[PDB]
Design a protein around this ligand. Structure first.
Ligand SMILES: O=C(CN(CCO)S(=O)(=O)c1ccc(-c2ccccc2)cc1)NO
Ligand SMILES: [Ca+2]
Ligand SMILES: [Ca+2]
Ligand SMILES: [Ca+2]
Ligand SMILES: [Zn+2]
Ligand SMILES: [Zn+2]
Length: 158
């Protein structure tokens, strides 16, 4: 399916979850993009105004696309594959409790998975892969993509 056909990609944080400090939201999303630019030719930059390639949004329940959220638990987030408009956007369910650590749902780890979809990756059947479609906390300070994530992204870029 689709990929970004350019190397400089922008993101914008539309709004901030009250679950976290603002600077911690910024850092979690920045670190999550860095996971992917570590293993591709892509470069990611945060913009504070205008149209981004990837718009990062916190929202709950029905929020203007055809992918309504479901309250606490269940669906944690979703993202759209590369393309114009909503393409690339990553939406995080505000009914979850986002954190920097092992409590609640860790924003960084979730954003790594969603940004994988924003770049064109699907799900992996390997439980070790960040693209495996079940959230599990792992220590974020030593986090690494699996071999499967690496082969997957490198099949699309680089
Ligand atoms: O894949 C999904 C939707 N979800 C899976 C079932 O449809 S989910 O439950 O919201 C979800 C979202 C993220 C993760 C995830 C988060 C961090 C690391 C690994 C997986 C797993 C499930 N969105 O990307
Ligand atoms: Ca939910
Ligand atoms: Ca977009
Ligand atoms: Ca919340
Ligand atoms: Zn959505
Ligand atoms: Zn997913």
């Amino acid at each position: 399916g689709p990929v970004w056909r350019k190397h400089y990609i922008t993101y914008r944080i539309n709004n901030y979850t009250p679950d976290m400090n603002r600077e911690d939201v910024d850092y979690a999303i920045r670190k999550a993009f860095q996971v992917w630019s570590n293993v591709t030719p892509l470069k990611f930059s945060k913009i504070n105004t205008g149209m981004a390639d990837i718009l990062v949004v916190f929202a709950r329940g029905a929020h203007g696309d055809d992918h309504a959220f479901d309250g606490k638990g269940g669906i944690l987030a979703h993202a759209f594959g590369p393309g114009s408009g909503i393409g690339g956007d990553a939406h995080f369910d505000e009914d979850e409790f986002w954190t920097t650590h092992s409590g609640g749902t860790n924003l960084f780890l979730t954003a790594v998975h969603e940004i994988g979809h924003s770049l064109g990756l699907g799900h992996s059947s390997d439980p070790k892969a960040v693209m495996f479609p079940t959230y599990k906390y792992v220590d974020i300070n030593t986090f690494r993509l699996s071999a499967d994530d690496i082969r997957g992204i490198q099949s699309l870029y680089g």
